Amino acid sequence: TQSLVSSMRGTLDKLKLIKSMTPMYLQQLAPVELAVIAPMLPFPPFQVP
């Protein structure tokens, strides 16, 4: 019954411009952490492409 265009647009922009550093962590540091602990695991990795 009322326009929500301004409210929806404002909320989405805040989500898009959030100062989250998780994508930074996953791309750079997460692979290194997986690599260092992989040889020490009791069950060595088993992967398919």
Partner: protein, 49 residues
Amino acid sequence: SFRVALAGWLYNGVVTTVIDDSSYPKDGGSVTSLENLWDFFILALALPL
């Protein structure tokens, strides 16, 4: 609501004044109803502000 509407003229950039949904007829109305005719009159006179 009258003087609120007059005040709202200075801030149409961030605030948009609209008529509330409850002012409209509940089921749309019918021209065979005097009450609905009065509803139309009231809404028509109130909208242009």
